[PDB]
Amino acid sequence: IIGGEFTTIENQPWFAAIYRRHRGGSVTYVCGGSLMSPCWVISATHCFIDYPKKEDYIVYLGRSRLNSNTQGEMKFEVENLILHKDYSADTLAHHNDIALLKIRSKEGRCAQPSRTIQTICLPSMYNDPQFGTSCEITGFGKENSTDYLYPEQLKMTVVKLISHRECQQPHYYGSEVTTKMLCAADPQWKTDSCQGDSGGPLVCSLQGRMTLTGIVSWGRGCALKDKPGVYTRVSHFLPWIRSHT
Numbered sequence: 001i002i003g004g005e006f007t008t009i010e011n012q013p014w015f016a017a018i019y020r021r022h023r024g025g026s027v028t029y030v031c032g033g034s035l036m037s038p039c040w041v042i043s044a045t046h047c048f049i050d051y052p053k054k055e056d057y058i059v060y061l062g063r064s065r066l067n068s069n070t071q072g073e074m075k076f077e078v079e080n081l082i083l084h085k086d087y088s089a090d091t092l093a094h095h096n097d098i099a100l101l102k103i104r105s106k107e108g109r110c111a112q113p114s115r116t117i118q119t120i121c122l123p124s125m126y127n128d129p130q131f132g133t134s135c136e137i138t139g140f141g142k143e144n145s146t147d148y149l150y151p152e153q154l155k156m157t158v159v160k161l162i163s164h165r166e167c168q169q170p171h172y173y174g175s176e177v178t179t180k181m182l183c184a185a186d187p188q189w190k191t192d193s194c195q196g197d198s199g200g201p202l203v204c205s206l207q208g209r210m211t212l213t214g215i216v217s218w219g220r221g222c223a224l225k226d227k228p229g230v231y232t233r234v235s236h237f238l239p240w241i242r243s244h245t
């Protein structure tokens with residue numbers, strides 16, 4: 001996150017920290033995720049497309065720092081890694097960038113809800129918050145575009161949803177942004193998600209209930225003028241999630 005505020009997992013019960021083991025033994029952070037149901041996590045396909053082995057991943061819940069085992073956390077493994085069957089990556093835009101990771105602990109059980117481990121509701125058919133709505137994003141991603149290390153503590157920030165016609169203007173993303181994607185950004189371009197945040201939650205309070213409306217996907221740079229952050233429009237993929245879970 002660029003700018004924003006430092007927060008602790010208690011505020012983001014449904015945020016999943018996804019890691020990956022390397023030959024030799026080191027473990028680096030990869031991407032974020034959202035707790036769908038006790039046994040499922042949803043993220044982005046571009047965080048696993050290159051190393052499609054369910055065995056190389058680790059998924060943490062209730063973890064507040066990168067190199068610390070926060071009180072009440074749970075360590076998991078990927079029982080099933082399902083990727084959208086039509087994914088492609090262009091110069092900027094990423095298509096069908098949605099993914100399902102069916103988690104499972106060494107003992108064979110799924111997540112166990114608590115004060116620090118919760119789930120968010122999926123959006124419903126054709127019901128997306130209007131443009132200009134404020135929503136939050138979370139991740140252990142960069143705090144600057146020139147840093148190579150991630151913040152040791154979880155961060156969060158708020159942005160505003162941008163209409164589709166406004167995201168297709170020449171000085172924005174032209175025809176690169178498609179109707180199955182959403183755009184969000186700070187009207188002052190000082191705060192925004194960035195590299196390391198991909199796959200993470202974009203939560204909008206829709207008609208009372210906190211809804212998972214977007215999945216961090218792509219964007220030109222981080223917090224750059226007229227260059228919003230593009231997210232995966234969950235509502236569109238409901239039939240996919242349902243039939244695939």
Ligand SMILES: CC(C)[C@@H]1NCCc2ccc(NC(=O)c3ccc4cc(C(=N)N)ccc4c3)cc21
Nearest residue numbers: 046050193194195198217218219221222223229
């Ligand atoms: C190491 C890297 C090149 C990695 N390789 C596997 C394929 C692949 C695909 C996309 C990405 N994505 C990013 O690095 C990446 C970089 C910047 C991003 C910026 C925003 C945003 N400005 N809100 C929103 C999302 C962003 C995602 C990384 C990789």
